Design a protein around this ligand. Structure first.
Ligand SMILES: *[C@@H]1O[C@H](CO)[C@@H](O[C@@H]2O[C@H](CO)[C@@H](O)[C@H](O)[C@H]2NC(C)=O)[C@H](O)[C@H]1NC(C)=O
Ligand SMILES: *[C@@H]1O[C@H](CO)[C@@H](O[C@@H]2O[C@H](CO)[C@@H](O)[C@H](O)[C@H]2NC(C)=O)[C@H](O)[C@H]1NC(C)=O
Ligand SMILES: *[C@@H]1O[C@H](CO)[C@@H](O[C@@H]2O[C@H](CO)[C@@H](O)[C@H](O)[C@H]2NC(C)=O)[C@H](O)[C@H]1NC(C)=O
Ligand SMILES: *[C@@H]1O[C@H](CO)[C@@H](O[C@@H]2O[C@H](CO)[C@@H](O)[C@H](O)[C@H]2NC(C)=O)[C@H](O)[C@H]1NC(C)=O
Ligand SMILES: *[C@@H]1O[C@H](CO)[C@@H](O[C@@H]2O[C@H](CO)[C@@H](O)[C@H](O)[C@H]2NC(C)=O)[C@H](O)[C@H]1NC(C)=O
Ligand SMILES: *[C@@H]1O[C@H](CO)[C@@H](O[C@@H]2O[C@H](CO)[C@@H](O)[C@H](O)[C@H]2NC(C)=O)[C@H](O)[C@H]1NC(C)=O
Ligand SMILES: *[C@@H]1O[C@H](CO)[C@@H](O[C@@H]2O[C@H](CO)[C@@H](O)[C@H](O)[C@H]2NC(C)=O)[C@H](O)[C@H]1NC(C)=O
Ligand SMILES: *[C@@H]1O[C@H](CO)[C@@H](O)[C@H](O)[C@H]1NC(C)=O
Ligand SMILES: *[C@@H]1O[C@H](CO)[C@@H](O)[C@H](O)[C@H]1NC(C)=O
Ligand SMILES: *[C@@H]1O[C@H](CO)[C@@H](O)[C@H](O)[C@H]1NC(C)=O
Ligand SMILES: *[C@@H]1O[C@H](CO)[C@@H](O)[C@H](O)[C@H]1NC(C)=O
Ligand SMILES: *[C@@H]1O[C@H](CO)[C@@H](O)[C@H](O)[C@H]1NC(C)=O
Ligand SMILES: *[C@@H]1O[C@H](CO)[C@@H](O)[C@H](O)[C@H]1NC(C)=O
Ligand SMILES: *[C@@H]1O[C@H](CO)[C@@H](O)[C@H](O)[C@H]1NC(C)=O
Ligand SMILES: *[C@@H]1O[C@H](CO)[C@@H](O)[C@H](O)[C@H]1NC(C)=O
Ligand SMILES: *[C@@H]1O[C@H](CO)[C@@H](O)[C@H](O)[C@H]1NC(C)=O
Lengths: 420, 384, 205, 49
């Protein structure tokens, strides 16, 4: 079939109609990012020559090819620790959560640590850890930070974020009640903070339910972690390709170096072994080149994840669709194998009404404009209201500012403006 | 470390210098227990060799082959060997050997090779292109000449028994037109039991210890161990993904041994700068503290670093949460890295902290922007 | 050691060039690493077999160098695009992006040149001497809930003030500093204090 | 000249493919760049080299 690009929509535009949302939904969206990859290192002399002294002497004639392969893989391996450090170690102190969870109805228990665990991951970090799944001189080096240290960093980032807002990124963590932190996060999206305090149970229930839906998604659906599982699969496929290439002849009498050395005498053997050295060395140069290019792709993703940590977790972001779809409120980091997961909380406006609108109001021949918000009408009366949530206020000399006379403005309307 | 870096100063850090490899303790030779000397005398000293239109093949099996008795015989005008060198044959062994015996004119020995051409190679004696074996020939004008017109000439190893038939006037006064005997030995290397092996004597077997082994000519190094691998009766060897042999059946006692390569790993050397101390600590990567101020990290056995129960910022990174530093009376110490100072934020539902003062900080960020614009004249680099 | 990022970029390019030069001493399986030995010792038919080993190895040595310089140039370009973005947003502007222009709230940045790089002196406001205060989301007065226009309600223990978020400056709570929204009963943790009307004494006088 | 970045990306990919095709004319040290010359002039043992 021809692919559908999306459902078609005529936006109901006219020169005097505006749609204002009368209600919202607190969306929680999950963004998964690769941060590191398996720190392989290959002993190129043991890969090429397998402890044959005869081959090892021939491999010296190729000079510093072997030492610069080990250098390149060591540079890749060291930057995996750098990538992991730059994402998670953005917090100077290991902040910890209070014994009492008085967060104004919000419930972080599924994203905060559980002391019951052998490694103190959260409930969602355990789902994220469950949904991701030689003697030839190839080896895997451990990461510098263990998954238990990564979980202490995501716990510190999260406990700072909950107890202190953005302030733990700008200086010392300044405590603030979570209902009042969210009231600032509403002002940061241009929604007047009374909208939170008047709807606080609803907003808390929508957040708690949206976190519950993350657990239901991650418990059922293994394809969620596809970016991290792809990074595991590529590194495993690259190592298995590198091992399988030891079975290749490259034009020698055998793929097995001990056949050559048991069947042929020195002058005849060294001709055959040089074909295996040439092919196995080309096989490493191919592997290390593709790992250098893959490491640059992981570093670009780690720099992005480190930027989402700073701007989405340690801050609130004005950047459209950077911290998930909708107007960003806040993000919570969760660790995952070779990656990070951000639970981006966003305000999404949700139940429109259509209103007649005007740029300005004529009163006494003066043109009045909104200080903040929009003029709207229900059909009979004129109100001023904020842009992102319908709350109709009577039009007054406090809600509005004069600028000049009526005649200049295209589409000005006549209504009284009350002077308190 | 100094030799690895090609430098006499070493800066502070951890350097993968070298490879630890447990050495073979002794050499182990396993061959079948059979002692019949192979019937090469009944091949090479036969009363009459066959005609090349109708060559004879002798199977050689269940016997010991002393190939130097052949190779040292100055009578042989050629002893060309292909997938093997004639010096190696005593160290090496085969499931069967097949000897093809016949007479040709002395000019025609040149046709008897893999991929060669001419009427004898085209009609009546064709070798495979991937032939493993030896072609052995000598002048027989002293014995097969009379002439001796009983000698007659016409796929690989197919016996093609006016039409394409001719015969030779072999007479003692003939130089190209003289008779030569040829023996072609074909060696069956395949992964069944060997039955034609060199004179090389078998040792006893050794288990659970690193050894320089040889089974039926399969040389290697490893720890031999008993195994649960159900080899089917026709199978002598088992292979890894890399084609390297992973298990074997012993030729004298038909039990199955795993081969494991002897314990090995990278040798990282942990150093403060040489312009600070000449003391170092050594990390045997992935190795347990057994094969090698000793401490088993999850990165490997660490030696010469003093384990400390405190924690500090990571100075030199070892791996798996461990770091090392040089500290006071001085030693290299190894410790779990500190992530930062712990802090309970003083949260309650009605408490806020507001800052009464500020500091204007100036922070310095350094960024690379360009690199040296090199240009290499590749013809002058390559050819000078 | 402050300049470590720029000195690393110098060291990598010098290490790559020295590796490329040292590879001219390699035999690659020829009778000599020196091309004039081959050409003085061997005649053309024999020499061309040896020289093709040196051409093959030196060409592989160059392809290895150019491949690693292409990947290194892409890493430098990513850093140059970042430096060009810090120039636009931190120097030519003021950045709201947390930790983009140094730690703390960004004020301004000054560029300084350095060998193969740039250095930004990111000036930032860091808040520095806290006090703890009792706080409330809103104030009940005459049954109306009042909220701050800008800043926060705080108490020193006996009196209620409104103050900006990032620097303690206590202002008396007034109908100019605060806005009404609805009645008291809806708000979780509202507190009872008077809110001063600045007009009232002007008309009472 | 306005579209210079997009035309550069087209030109680089065309230059890379034309370089890859032109390299089929190279001998690399063989008796001919043309594989059917080798296979019509030389018999198996000599041709495979
Ligand atoms: C926060 O939410 C969690 C579920 O997301 C609640 O945990 C459940 O609590 C009840 C008892 O109240 C137990 O019977 C369940 O077994 C718990 N489920 C899990 C998965 O632990 C928790 O009660 C909520 N917290 C508060 C203070 O209401
Ligand atoms: C705004 O939308 C929310 C849902 O997002 C509405 O809340 C639900 O209302 C029904 C009854 O109409 C209740 O049964 C549900 O339990 C409520 N859901 C939650 C999450 O609390 C809300 O009524 C809407 N308000 C307005 C003014 O439209
Ligand atoms: C537009 O809004 C105004 C004010 O909310 C509405 O006027 C009020 O309507 C109710 C009945 O719905 C009356 O009890 C009030 O006395 C009215 N107040 C005034 C000041 O007139 C008006 O009805 C709305 N119009 C529409 C079309 O919805
Ligand atoms: C707003 O109200 C004013 C009167 O208060 C309207 O002005 C009159 O407009 C007509 C038609 O243009 C003129 O004939 C009159 O002379 C105007 N009177 C005055 C006092 O100016 C004005 O048209 C109204 N605006 C809209 C958009 O309806
Ligand atoms: C094996 O035997 C078959 C006959 O059964 C041979 O096939 C004939 O080959 C000649 C050319 O040599 C052709 O002219 C005939 O037409 C073939 N006959 C059939 C029935 O195909 C075959 O050539 C023999 N193999 C060899 C290598 O000599
Ligand atoms: C809280 O702030 C108020 C106003 O700054 C303080 O009240 C004043 O206290 C001084 C003495 O420190 C008196 O001279 C004034 O007459 C008081 N003014 C009023 C209107 O009462 C109050 O003392 C502070 N309380 C605390 C605990 O610091
Ligand atoms: C704020 O002040 C009002 C009175 O001005 C308090 O309301 C009284 O609360 C008590 C205890 O619940 C009741 O017995 C009275 O009947 C209430 N009076 C009125 C007029 O409602 C209110 O409780 C105070 N709020 C807080 C948070 O202390
Ligand atoms: C707004 O008015 C248009 C008139 O065509 C209608 O299609 C649209 O559904 C209305 N939207 C809402 C949210 O009422
Ligand atoms: C909208 O367009 C109509 C004509 O279609 C015009 O009379 C009216 O003044 C316009 N109003 C505004 C707000 O531009
Ligand atoms: C052939 O016979 C002679 C003695 O007549 C003996 O010296 C020689 O070793 C024999 N060769 C073989 C292969 O048995
Ligand atoms: C061969 O040697 C083994 C001991 O290595 C022995 O058990 C076996 O019985 C022997 N077989 C024969 C036929 O002598
Ligand atoms: C090297 O060591 C000497 C003391 O022997 C010290 O004065 C000097 O500052 C050191 N230099 C460096 C670069 O560490
Ligand atoms: C090291 O080896 C001993 C047996 O020699 C074993 O008990 C121990 O569990 C091993 N430790 C590690 C970390 O491998
Ligand atoms: C670390 O401290 C424990 C007691 O807390 C002690 O038993 C142990 O011996 C110490 N280890 C070292 C290496 O000093
Ligand atoms: C705020 O009060 C708590 C009371 O437990 C205390 O722990 C904390 O250090 C105080 N902070 C400041 C900045 O005074
Ligand atoms: C804080 O919690 C107490 C109970 O511990 C409760 O009485 C009070 O109303 C709460 N205040 C706020 C601001 O949530």
């Amino acid at each position: 079939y021809t692919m559908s690009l999306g459902a078609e929509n005529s936006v109901a535009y006219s020169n005097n109609s505006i749609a204002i949302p009368t209600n919202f939904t607190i969306s929680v969206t999950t963004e998964i990012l690769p941060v590191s990859m398996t720190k392989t290192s290959v002993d190129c002399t043991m890969y090429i020559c397998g402890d044959s002294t005869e081959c090892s002497n021939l491999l010296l004639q190729y000079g510093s090819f072997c030492t610069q392969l080990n250098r390149a893989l060591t540079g890749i391996a060291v930057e995996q620790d750098k990538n992991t450090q730059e994402v998670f170690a953005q917090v100077k102190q290991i902040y910890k959560t209070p014994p009492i969870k008085d967060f104004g109805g919000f419930n972080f228990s599924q994203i905060l640590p559980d002391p019951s665990k052998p490694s103190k991951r959260s409930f969602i970090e355990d789902l994220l850890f469950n949904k991701v799944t030689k003697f030839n001189g190839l080896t895997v080096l451990p990461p510098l930070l263990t998954d238990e240290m990564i979980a202490q960093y995501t716990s510190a980032l999260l406990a700072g974020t909950i107890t202190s807002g953005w302030t733990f990124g700008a200086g010392a963590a300044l405590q603030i009640p979570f209902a009042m932190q969210m009231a600032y996060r509403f002002n940061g999206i241009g929604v007047t903070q009374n909208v939170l305090y008047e709807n606080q149970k609803l907003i808390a229930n929508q957040f708690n339910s949206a976190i519950g839906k993350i657990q239901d998604s991650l418990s059922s659906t293994a394809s969620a972690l596809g970016k991290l599982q792809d990074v595991v699969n590529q590194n495993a496929q690259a190592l298995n390709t590198l091992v399988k290439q030891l079975s290749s002849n490259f034009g020698a009498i055998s793929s097995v170096l001990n056949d050559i050395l048991s069947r042929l005498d020195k002058v005849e053997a060294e001709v055959q072994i040089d074909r295996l050295i040439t092919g196995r060395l080309q096989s490493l140069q191919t592997y290390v080149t593709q790992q250098l290019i893959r490491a640059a792709e992981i570093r670009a993703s780690a720099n992005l994840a480190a930027t989402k940590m700073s701007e989405c977790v340690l801050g609130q972001s004005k950047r459209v669709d950077f911290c998930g779809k909708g107007y960003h409120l806040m993000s919570f980091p969760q660790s995952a194998p070779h990656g990070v997961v951000f639970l981006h909380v966003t305000y999404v406006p949700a139940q429109e009404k259509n209103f007649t609108t005007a740029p300005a109001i004529c009163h006494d021949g003066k043109a009045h404009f909104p200080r903040e918000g929009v003029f709207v009408s229900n059909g009979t009366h004129w109100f001023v209201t904020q842009r992102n949530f319908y709350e109709p206020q009577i039009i007054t000399t406090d809600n509005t500012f004069v600028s000049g006379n009526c005649d200049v403005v295209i589409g000005i309307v006549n209504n009284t403006v009350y002077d308190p | 470390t100094k030799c690895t870096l090609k430098s006499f100063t070493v800066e502070k850090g951890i350097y993968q210098t070298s490879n630890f490899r447990v050495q073979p303790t002794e050499s182990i030779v396993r061959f079948p227990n059979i002692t019949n000397l192979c019937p090469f005398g009944e091949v090479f000293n036969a009363t009459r060799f066959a005609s090349v239109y109708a060559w004879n093949r002798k199977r050689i099996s269940n016997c010991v082959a002393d190939y130097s008795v052949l190779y040292n015989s100055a009578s042989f005008s050629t002893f060309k060997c292909y997938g093997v060198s004639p010096t190696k044959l005593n160290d090496l062994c085969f499931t069967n050997v097949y000897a093809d015996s016949f007479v040709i004119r002395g000019d025609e020995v040149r046709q008897i090779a893999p991929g060669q051409t001419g009427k004898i190679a085209d009609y009546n004696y064709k070798l495979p292109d991937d032939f493993t074996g030896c072609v052995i020939a000598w002048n027989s004008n002293n014995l097969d000449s009379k002439g001796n017109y009983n000698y007659l000439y016409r796929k690989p190893f197919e016996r093609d028994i006016y039409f394409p038939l001719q015969s030779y006037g072999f007479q003692p006064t003939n130089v190209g037109y003289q008779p030569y005997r040829v023996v072609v030995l074909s060696f069956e290397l395949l992964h069944a039991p060997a039955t034609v092996c060199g004179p090389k004597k078998s040792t006893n077997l050794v288990k659970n210890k690193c050894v320089n082994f040889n089974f039926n000519g399969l040389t290697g190094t490893g720890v031999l161990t008993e195994s649960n691998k159900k080899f089917l009766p026709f199978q002598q060897f088992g292979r890894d993904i890399a084609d390297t042999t992973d298990a074997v059946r012993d030729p004298q006692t038909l039990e199955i041994l795993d081969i494991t390569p002897c314990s090995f790993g990278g040798v990282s050397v942990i150093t403060p700068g040489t312009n600070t101390s000449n003391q170092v600590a050594v990390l045997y990567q992935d190795v347990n503290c057994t094969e090698v101020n000793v401490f088993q990290t999850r990165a490997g056995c660490l030696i010469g670093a003093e384990h400390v129960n405190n924690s500090y910022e990571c100075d030199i990174p070892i791996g798996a949460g461990i770091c090392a530093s040089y500290q006071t009376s001085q030693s290299i110490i190894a410790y779990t890295m500190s992530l930062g100072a712990e802090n309970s934020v003083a949260y309650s539902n009605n408490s806020i902290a507001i800052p009464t003062n500020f500091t204007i900080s100036v922070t310095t960020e350094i960024l690379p922007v360009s690199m040296t614009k090199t240009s290499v004249d590749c013809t002058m680099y390559i050819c000078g | 050691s402050a300049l470590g990022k720029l000195q690393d970029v110098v060291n990598q390019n010098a290490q790559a060039l020295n590796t490329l030069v040292k590879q001219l001493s390699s035999n690659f399986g020829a009778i000599s690493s020196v091309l004039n030995d081959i050409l003085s010792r061997l005649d053309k038919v024999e020499a061309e077999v040896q020289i093709d080993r040196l051409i093959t190895g030196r060409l592989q040595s160059l392809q290895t160098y150019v491949t690693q310089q292409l990947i290194r140039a892409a890493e430098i370009r990513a850093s140059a695009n970042l430096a060009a973005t810090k120039m636009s947003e931190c120097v030519l502007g003021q950045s709201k992006r947390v930790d983009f222009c140094g730690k703390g709230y960004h004020l301004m940045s000054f560029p300084q040149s350095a060998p193969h790089g740039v250095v930004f002196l990111h000036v930032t406001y860091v808040p520095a001497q806290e006090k703890n205060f009792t706080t409330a989301p809103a104030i009940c007065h005459d049954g109306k809930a009042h909220f701050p226009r800008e800043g926060v309600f705080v108490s020193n223990g006996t009196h209620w003030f409104v103050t900006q978020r990032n620097f303690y400056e206590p202002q008396i709570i007034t109908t100019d500093n605060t806005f009404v929204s609805g009645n008291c009963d809806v708000v979780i943790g509202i507190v009872n204090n008077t809110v001063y009307d600045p007009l009232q004494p002007e008309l009472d006088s």
